[PDB]
Design an enzyme around this catalytic site. Structure first.
Site, PDB file in Angstrom:
ATOM      1  N   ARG A 111      -5.543   5.583  -0.443  1.00  0.00           N
ATOM      2  CA  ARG A 111      -4.337   4.747  -0.662  1.00  0.00           C
ATOM      3  C   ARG A 111      -4.496   4.067  -2.050  1.00  0.00           C
ATOM      4  NH1 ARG A 111      -3.713   6.882   3.513  1.00  0.00           N
ATOM      5  NH2 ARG A 111      -3.470   5.981   5.606  1.00  0.00           N
ATOM      6  N   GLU A 152       0.869  -1.230   0.000  1.00  0.00           N
ATOM      7  CA  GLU A 152       0.000   0.000   0.000  1.00  0.00           C
ATOM      8  C   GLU A 152       0.883   1.250   0.000  1.00  0.00           C
ATOM      9  OE1 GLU A 152      -0.491   1.470   3.916  1.00  0.00           O
ATOM     10  OE2 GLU A 152      -0.844  -0.627   4.574  1.00  0.00           O
ATOM     11  N   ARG A 211      -1.903  11.346   7.281  1.00  0.00           N
ATOM     12  CA  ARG A 211      -1.806  10.615   6.012  1.00  0.00           C
ATOM     13  C   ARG A 211      -3.239  10.348   5.474  1.00  0.00           C
ATOM     14  NH1 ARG A 211       0.103   5.572   6.992  1.00  0.00           N
ATOM     15  NH2 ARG A 211       0.169   5.009   4.733  1.00  0.00           N
ATOM     16  N   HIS A 249     -10.141   4.261   3.440  1.00  0.00           N
ATOM     17  CA  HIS A 249      -9.296   3.440   4.303  1.00  0.00           C
ATOM     18  C   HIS A 249      -9.662   1.949   4.274  1.00  0.00           C
ATOM     19  CE1 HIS A 249      -6.809   2.428   7.826  1.00  0.00           C
ATOM     20  NE2 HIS A 249      -5.984   3.130   7.083  1.00  0.00           N
TER      21      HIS A 249
HETATM   22  N1  LIG Z   1      -7.771  -2.265   7.711  1.00  0.00           N
HETATM   23  C1  LIG Z   1      -6.583  -2.704   7.314  1.00  0.00           C
HETATM   24  N2  LIG Z   1      -5.451  -2.075   7.624  1.00  0.00           N
HETATM   25  C2  LIG Z   1      -4.346  -2.689   7.099  1.00  0.00           C
HETATM   26  C3  LIG Z   1      -4.310  -3.852   6.344  1.00  0.00           C
HETATM   27  N3  LIG Z   1      -3.015  -4.198   6.002  1.00  0.00           N
HETATM   28  C4  LIG Z   1      -2.277  -3.245   6.501  1.00  0.00           C
HETATM   29  N4  LIG Z   1      -3.036  -2.295   7.179  1.00  0.00           N
HETATM   30  C5  LIG Z   1      -2.488  -1.115   7.887  1.00  0.00           C
HETATM   31  O1  LIG Z   1      -2.560  -1.456   9.278  1.00  0.00           O
HETATM   32  C6  LIG Z   1      -3.054  -0.313  10.032  1.00  0.00           C
HETATM   33  C7  LIG Z   1      -3.623  -0.841  11.346  1.00  0.00           C
HETATM   34  O2  LIG Z   1      -5.061  -0.776  11.345  1.00  0.00           O
HETATM   35  C8  LIG Z   1      -3.975   0.391   9.056  1.00  0.00           C
HETATM   36  O3  LIG Z   1      -4.121   1.760   9.418  1.00  0.00           O
HETATM   37  C9  LIG Z   1      -3.193   0.260   7.744  1.00  0.00           C
HETATM   38  O4  LIG Z   1      -2.229   1.248   7.790  1.00  0.00           O
HETATM   39  P1  LIG Z   1      -2.202   2.425   6.733  1.00  0.00           P
HETATM   40  O5  LIG Z   1      -2.744   3.646   7.410  1.00  0.00           O
HETATM   41  O6  LIG Z   1      -0.755   2.594   6.433  1.00  0.00           O
HETATM   42  O7  LIG Z   1      -3.096   2.194   5.500  1.00  0.00           O
HETATM   43  C10 LIG Z   1      -5.517  -4.538   6.064  1.00  0.00           C
HETATM   44  O8  LIG Z   1      -5.517  -5.581   5.424  1.00  0.00           O
HETATM   45  N5  LIG Z   1      -6.623  -3.895   6.584  1.00  0.00           N
END
Ligand SMILES: Nc1nc2c(ncn2[C@@H]2O[C@H](CO)[C@@H](O)[C@H]2OP(=O)(O)O)c(=O)[nH]1
Ligand SMILES: Nc1nc2c(ncn2[C@@H]2O[C@H](CO)[C@@H](O)[C@H]2OP(=O)(O)O)c(=O)[nH]1
Lengths: 96, 96
Positions: free
Chosen positions: A69, A54, A65, A85
């Site tokens: 994404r 991501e 941020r 998100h």
């Molecule tokens: N909801 C969600 N968050 C993910 C996933 N994989 C990685 N993340 C990241 O893990 C964090 C913990 O909830 C999320 O904020 C997201 O960060 P990002 O803000 O960098 O997108 C996923 O599969 N689902």
């Protein structure tokens, strides 16, 4: 499930910036750019861990941020946009 | 995005004055000189809060601070000029 395709020209302009950075392998603005996306809610097709990554799509005016994404997959042009998100995703069509 | 690089000699002479004041740490004509520039619109490269600071570039004849400013970044020689109150920026080249 993926919610259909979206034309790149219809997304916020920062979406184009992020794709450009992904193409040149950065340098990325945030240290969290390029981390694996786990697809823990299974919205996208199930794949081995590490298949998806991501990248932040900057939201001008946000103090964080934010929630936009781009998620890439390993297939060619396999790039998904999410503006909420990871609740929903659309496959980006770079030709429109 | 930054519009390009411009020689200091091609900018209004007041830009030179402002850069000279920044080199000596003032004194500055306005109390707002030296406050943090938030980069809220994401026009300049993403950096931590406080990496950028703003300084007035006097507009001859104006009763207010007007729209000209110099934004410094923490890097060596990183200074940007804006003549339109942060809509656009150019990097200043002090060598010409
Ligand atoms: N909801 C969600 N968050 C993910 C996933 N994989 C990685 N993340 C990241 O893990 C964090 C913990 O909830 C999320 O904020 C997201 O960060 P990002 O803000 O960098 O997108 C996923 O599969 N689902
Ligand atoms: N547009 C903008 N103004 C900023 C920023 N950081 C500080 N400012 C100052 O904050 C004010 C209220 O938003 C702006 O009018 C501007 O006042 P100055 O002209 O004093 O720089 C920024 O990142 N963007």
């Amino acid at each position: 499930d993926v919610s259909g395709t979206v034309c790149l020209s219809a997304l916020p302009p920062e979406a184009t910036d992020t794709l450009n950075l992904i193409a040149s392998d950065g340098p990325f603005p945030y240290s969290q750019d390029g981390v694996v996306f786990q697809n823990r809610e299974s919205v996208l097709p199930t794949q081995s861990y590490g298949y998806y990554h991501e990248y932040t799509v900057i939201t001008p005016g946000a103090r964080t941020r934010g929630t936009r994404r781009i998620i890439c997959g390993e297939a060619t042009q396999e790039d998904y946009y999410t503006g909420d998100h990871y609740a929903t995703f659309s496959l980006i069509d770079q030709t429109c």
